[PDB]
Structure formats: structure tokens, C-alpha cells
Amino acid sequence: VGSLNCIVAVSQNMGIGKNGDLPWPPLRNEFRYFQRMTTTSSVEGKQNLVIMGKKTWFSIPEKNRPLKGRINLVLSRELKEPPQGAHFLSRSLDDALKLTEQPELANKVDMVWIVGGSSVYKEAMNHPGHLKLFVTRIMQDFESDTFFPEIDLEKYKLLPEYPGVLSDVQEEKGIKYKFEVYEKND
Numbered sequence: 086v087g088s089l090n091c092i093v094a095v096s097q098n099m100g101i102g103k104n105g106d107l108p109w110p111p112l113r114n115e116f117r118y119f120q121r122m123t124t125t126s127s128v129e130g131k132q133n134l135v136i137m138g139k140k141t142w143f144s145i146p147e148k149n150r151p152l153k154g155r156i157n158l159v160l161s162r163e164l165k166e167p168p169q170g171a172h173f174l175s176r177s178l179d180d181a182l183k184l185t186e187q188p189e190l191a192n193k194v195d196m197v198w199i200v201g202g203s204s205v206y207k208e209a210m211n212h213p214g215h216l217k218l219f220v221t222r223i224m225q226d227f228e229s230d231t232f233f234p235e236i237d238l239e240k241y242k243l244l245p246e247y248p249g250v251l252s253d254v255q256e257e258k259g260i261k262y263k264f265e266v267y268e269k270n271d
């Protein structure tokens with residue numbers, strides 16, 4: 086079990102979702118990077134694990150579920166079994182990480198990626214330990230219904246750079262955004 090990382094795309098107003106989907110038009114390069122980041126493994130024969138709440142799992146188009154090349158995990162206190170297509174189900178973020186420690190998975194998984202949503206971000210974000218937040222800053226306001234918790238800047242530092250992450254403003258469909266990385270250790 087290597088790195089613990091969060092990944093999110095937020096609008097100027099700190100908003101990640103609107104009625105089950107994103108607040109913005111689909112940015113395919115944005116999705117490209119999301120997929121590239123979460124799927125790439127720095128260790129041969131090992132895979133990345135993605136942790137998502139049940140409403141995030143349900144917002145991924147059916148056809149792209151479970152996300153490919155990735156070990157998929159849903160979080161939920163209601164469901165009895167993983168939703169069709171899922172690989173694992175856990176009742177807590179602490180349980181999900183322990184499973185990583187199980188020999189089943191202990192040799193198959195490299196980094197673990199938290200893909201949301203909020204409640205889920207919030208807890209991981211405050212998890213004791215070393216962590217990184219890969220944030221896409223979508224540069225405009227989008228009416229949303231679900232938000233990203235605030236970044237505590239007194240704990241989380243913005244890096245001037247990071248290998249494999251474009252440092253310049255992207256713009257697609259007239260919507261500009263930038264990629265950022267925060268690092269923590271406490």
C-alpha cells in the first residue's frame with residue numbers, strides 16, 4: 086500500500102455536483118487526466134484502488150462502470166453487496182484502507198485514489214498522515230448542489246510544480262481551468 090491521494094474538479098464557487106452529475110459541460114481532457122492519474126501505476130503487476138461513495142458510483146455513466154484498470158470500491162452503510170459492476174463495498178473509509186492490509190489486496194494495490202464525494206473527501210482530508218490533493222480548479226461559477234470541503238492552508242501547501250501535471254491554464258469549450266497539487270504530512 087503506497088500513496089493515499091484525493092482527486093477532485095471544483096468550480097470557483099467550490100462546487101463539485103449538481104443533481105447527480107457535474108455542474109459543467111463535459112471537459113474531455115479533464116476526464117483524460119482524471120483517468121490517467123488514477124489508473125497509472127508506478128509498480129508492475131500492481132494496481133490503483135479508487136474509493137467513492139454510492140452517489141459518485143451512480144453518477145459514472147453505466148458503460149464506464151466500474152472504471153477500468155482500477156480496483157473499484159463503493160462506500161455505503163445501506164447496501165449489502167457491492168452495486169453491480171463494483172469490486173468491493175465497505176461501511177467506512179477506515180475499513181476500506183484496512184482491506185488494503187489484507188493479503189488478498191496487499192500485493193495487488195500500489196496507490197489508493199479517493200474520488201469523492203464530499204463526506205468522503207472531508208474525512209480522508211482529515212485522516213492522520215501524509216496525503217496529497219490533486220485539484221482541478223475550474224475557473225468560473227457553476228450552480229451546484231454539493232461542495233468540496235475547505236482546504237486548510239495552514240496544514241496543506243500548494244506545490245510550485247509536480248511531475249506529469251501541466252502548470253498552465255487549460256481552456257476547453259471556453260472554460261478555463263488549472264491543475265494543482267497540495268501536499269500534507271501531519
Ligand SMILES: NC(=O)C1=CN([C@@H]2O[C@H](COP(=O)(O)OP(=O)(O)OC[C@H]3O[C@@H](n4cnc5c(N)ncnc54)[C@H](OP(=O)(O)O)[C@@H]3O)[C@@H](O)[C@H]2O)C=CC1
Nearest residue numbers: 093094102105106138139140141144161162163201202203
Ligand atoms: N467534480 C468532481 O470532482 C466530482 C463530482 N462528483 C459529483 O458530485 C455528486 C457526488 O456527491 P455526494 O453527495 O457527496 O456523494 P457520495 O458520492 O459521497 O455519496 C454519498 C453516499 O455514500 C456513502 N458514504 C459517503 N461517504 C461515506 C463514509 N465516509 N463512510 C461510509 N459511507 C459513506 C453514503 O452511502 P449510504 O447512504 O449507503 O450509507 C452516502 O449516502 C454527484 O453530483 C457526482 O456526479 C463526485 C465526485 C467528484
Ligand SMILES: CN(Cc1cnc2nc(N)nc(N)c2n1)c1ccc(C(=O)N[C@@H](CCC(=O)O)C(=O)O)cc1
Nearest residue numbers: 092093094116117119120144145146149152153200221
Ligand atoms: C461523475 N464523475 C466523477 C468525477 C468527474 N470528474 C472528476 N475530475 C476530477 N479531477 N476528480 C474527480 N474525482 C472527478 N470525478 C465521473 C464521470 C465519468 C467518469 C469516467 O467515465 N471516467 C473514465 C474516463 C473516461 C473518459 O476519458 O472520458 C475512466 O476510465 O476513468 C469518471 C468520473
